[PDB]
Design a protein around this ligand. Structure first.
Ligand code: PLP
Ligand code: PLP
Lengths: 387, 386
């Protein structure tokens, strides 16, 4: 009868984790209140008290997105899981789908779109670029899409995509606007209803400083109508918006068991939303803008070059630096964690090998942290081998 | 000029009630798991995170009793693991046989339909289980590529026998997928020895970790089918080729796919360390004994167990026939209102027919049996009887 697999020796040792100052494109470090919420005991996942916390979270999401949309809720997964929830519900097989492919995030949207049978049309742009109204209109006119995807904060390239006017333009072409604000939310201006966005989503782990694992999403009535009139069922059950809507209190029926929400992660997310509700959006935008401007000045004084030349196009939360000539970017990243216990990153997708990425996210977006990463980079530039 | 003002409810502190959770799960968290949930973040692609991931993988191989290389965590709840299994294993048009003896088989049918399989339910009333002979007829008639069976049917209180089923499926060139969300750690289960090709469970049952992560492992036969199919799975998030790579299961450097739930992995790591320290067979013994003690106390109250055959009772989730004359909703409310204990009614086909009492992991104790027994005694004495 004897078990062949034995208790793993490594698990018989205590868990211990290193102390790391996370100054990459995210996830970010957690403030005390969010760590404390993470250590709390479970409550019933369909209890009145749980529903009250969920309702508070929904109010918080409506605040940070600046929307009145009733159909606003949490997706029980990471930012990719929220994008897939948007696409698997809004798009039916054969639907035309226009995508701003200007970095890895647009590429990921193309991949998901293809998999669920859309007719996908990328607008491809080198890393560093953004879309104009004219570029979008040309795509809308040519491809007659039911949905456009735009990345607001392109954290792979350091770009801040302008959003004014795009929603109205899409709507003239009978197109819904979907916007990724995972890296932008809380760090730079964003107004869902004022900007005519139809589907907006973000993640817990960037400027909100919650642990990775949950994501935030909201749907206009136009998007709501399309999702509820579909004649095909979405390919996913877990992400079916009719079930999720009901369980999050968004429709007129009693909440029915769908899947078990991540109770403890929702405590933490609730607290992250309370913190930014206390600080205020505009104050948070100012904090990130100023920290970013300070970082840009210090990096240039090190002799590094910002990847995005035009300051109005720079994403405050994630700054791209050209890799300095003669260095191997891997040495610089390794040097910084090895000798300073600071995380930064290289590039990602099309910016792989071209940039270093430095994040300033929420409570970590400070002049004091700018000074730490500046000194770490200075030392890497002094000691890493140069060709 | 901002449209939306800060919500006043969020300007108050978070406060949660104390609840003793003795339903079908999620279960309460032991102090070590709560402490891990309170730790600081590390880098989601850091060397230290990969080591923790590797320790988790060894833990899963331990609790499943497998050596499969393709073993990993799904970043979502038990439904998400089931969808990962089916969306990668099944291509559109594949024949899919399902043991629909409660809500969990019904859910498998729904997902299977959505992803274009040709679904064949074997439908049984709540309380039933499948024999080898009934599965063999389904295999012969429908020539499925995959069979789904629920091991611990937490909606009906049933313990499904597993010996023999994998071997049967393989004679018919069918893969065996088993849901062990409710049974893992609380009753015997051997992935390799029972010939199971896909096995999954959840964090929040007997493991006593918070909900939100799930455990999955694939045999070489399942691995071969997933890596052979000519169509891409409908999901990117759940694509096994990307996930296998990031979890260190394949021959290539780990590439970014999606950000794993760092803090939840700390907690799941500790949940696996705890049962590694206890030892699997000791855990099985604890659940078996706690459930037998529960069964006698409940019968001594005049209650009737829903599953008549003791060998068919799932130790982790016990169903009780709702007693004649009472409104089950009054009984459930009485227990939370006056004793701060959570129990449940039924689910899916058992709705209105049962109360469900869970004994899960560190909560599967004689002490907790005494607590819920006293609460039900009081409920029977004070709830209205028709
Ligand atoms: C608890 C349970 C599930 C739960 O899945 P979630 O998606 O995490 O809610 C699924 N199947 C069984 C048998 C369970 O007991
Ligand atoms: C961090 C980020 C994501 C990542 O999502 P995960 O699935 O949580 O890893 C997606 N898009 C953008 C713009 C991001 O900054």
């Amino acid at each position: 009868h004897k078990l062949l697999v034995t208790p793993p020796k490594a698990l018989l040792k205590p868990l211990s984790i290193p102390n790391q100052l996370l100054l990459g494109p995210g996830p970010s470090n957690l403030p005390p209140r969010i760590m404390a919420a993470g250590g709390l005991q479970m409550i019933g996942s369909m209890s009145k008290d749980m529903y009250q916390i969920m309702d508070e979270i929904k109010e918080g999401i409506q605040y940070v997105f600046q929307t009145r949309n009733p159909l606003t809720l949490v997706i029980s997964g990471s930012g990719h899981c929220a994008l897939e929830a948007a696409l698997v519900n809004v798009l039916e097989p054969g639907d035309s789908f226009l995508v701003g492919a200007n970095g890895i995030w647009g590429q990921r949207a193309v991949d998901i779109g293809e998999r669920i049978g859309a007719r996908v049309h990328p607008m491809t742009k080198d890393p560093g670029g953004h879309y104009t109204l004219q570029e979008v209109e040309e795509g809308l006119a040519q491809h007659k899409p039911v949905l456009l995807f735009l990345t607001h904060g392109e954290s792979s390239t350091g770009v801040l995509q302008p959003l004014d006017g795009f929603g109205e333009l899409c709507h003239r072409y009978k197109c819904l606007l979907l916007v990724n604000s995972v890296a932008s939310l809380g760090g730079t201006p964003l107004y869902m209803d004022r900007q005519g966005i139809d589907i907006l989503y973000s993640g817990s782990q960037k400027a909100l400083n919650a642990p990775p694992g949950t994501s935030l999403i909201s749907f206009s009535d136009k998007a709501k109508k399309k999702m509820y009139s579909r004649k095909t069922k979405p390919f996913s059950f877990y992400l079916d918006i009719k079930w999720l809507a009901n369980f999050w209190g968004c429709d007129d029926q009693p909440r029915m068991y769908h899947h078990t929400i991540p109770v403890i992660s929702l405590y933490s997310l609730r607290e992250s939303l309370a913190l930014i509700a206390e600080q205020g959006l505009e104050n948070s935008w100012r904090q990130h803008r100023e920290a970013a401007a300070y970082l840009h000045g210090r990096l240039q004084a090190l002799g590094l070059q910002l990847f995005v030349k035009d300051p109005a196009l720079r994403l405050p939360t994630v700054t791209t630096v050209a890799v300095p000539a003669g260095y191997d970017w891997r040495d610089i990243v390794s040097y910084v964690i090895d000798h300073f216990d600071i995380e930064i990153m290289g590039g990602l997708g099309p910016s792989t090998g071209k940039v270093l990425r430095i994040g300033l996210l929420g409570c970590n977006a400070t002049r004091e942290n700018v000074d730490r990463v500046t000194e770490a980079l200075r030392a890497a530039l002094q000691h890493c081998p140069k060709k």
